[PDB]
């Protein structure tokens, strides 16, 4: 996160760390949606151009963490994965369209003050919240700068941007499965995800039932917090059907 702040403790209890067994490193962010399912970006697991193609045993998922580097001995839980599901039409060849995967934990995790699943948006929730000018929140342990690494979890609140602006800021083909968010060069506030925040949640709090919903997944960007450039996120609602379909296809 570029130009964020340290999250408070238990501020984002669904925030998952995707961790490499060996070398022992942060892969990406992720999110807990039930007691057995974690949502992330497919580009965290599979990116054939950078030779990235992770399997179930290459990976560990650490939930409840606050510190990026410390083993938070009695607060975080570290789980094993049984299976990884990538959207069958994740386009890594061109624009990371449908950048979404599901990970099934080997065992259900126990909810705690620090662990708790985020909700997935329903059509009606998607429809009234996903609107230009409304702010969402991104969290992660990613780089602080495009060009170091936080100690603690970082948060930043960003506006959703109009589709036309998104599009005219890049040369890349933007699909309906994406939204972009960030301040304009003119707004006088900045912030953005960055490498290592990838796969994390963009969430919004419903003003109607006071719940937190995950509207987007940290997907891609051109730099980190570059003027006239925006963060792009997978549109979780548009891919909901897929999400349901696999959890019921084997879950869940």
């Amino acid at each position: 996160i570029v130009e964020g702040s340290d999250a408070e403790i238990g501020m984002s209890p669904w925030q998952v760390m995707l961790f490499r067994k060996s070398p022992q490193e942060l892969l990406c962010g992720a999110s807990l949606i039930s007691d057995r399912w974690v949502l992330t970006a497919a580009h965290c697991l599979l990116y054939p151009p950078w030779d990235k193609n992770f399997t179930e045993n290459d990976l560990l998922v650490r939930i409840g963490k606050h510190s990026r580097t410390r083993y938070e001995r009695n607060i975080e839980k570290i789980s094993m994965l049984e299976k990884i599901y990538i959207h069958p039409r994740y386009n890594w060849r061109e624009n990371l369209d449908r950048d979404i995967a599901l990970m099934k934990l080997k065992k259900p995790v126990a909810f705690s003050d620090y662990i708790h699943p985020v909700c997935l948006p329903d059509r009606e929730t998607a429809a009234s919240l996903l609107q230009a000018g409304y702010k969402g929140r991104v969290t992660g342990w990613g780089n602080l700068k495009e060009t170091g690494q936080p100690s603690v979890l970082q948060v930043v609140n960003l506006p959703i941007v109009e589709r036309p602006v998104c599009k005219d800021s890049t040369r890349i083909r933007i699909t309906d499965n994406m939204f972009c968010a960030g301040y304009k060069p003119d707004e006088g506030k900045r912030g953005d995800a960055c490498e290592g925040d990838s796969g994390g949640p963009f969430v919004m709090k419903s003003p109607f039932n006071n719940r937190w919903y995950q509207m987007g997944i940290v997907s891609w960007g051109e730099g980190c917090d570059r003027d006239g450039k925006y963060g792009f996120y997978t549109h979780v609602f548009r891919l909901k059907k897929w999400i349901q379909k696999v959890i019921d296809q084997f879950g869940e």
């Binding site: 067994k21 060996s22 022992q24 490193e25 942060l26 560990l60 580097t69 410390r70 083993y71 570290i78 094993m80 690494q149």
Partner: peptide, 10 residues
């Protein structure tokens, strides 16, 4: 950088 995790996770 990363602190060592309990053997059992591996």
């Amino acid at each position: 950088d990363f602190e060592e995790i309990p053997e059992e996770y591996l």
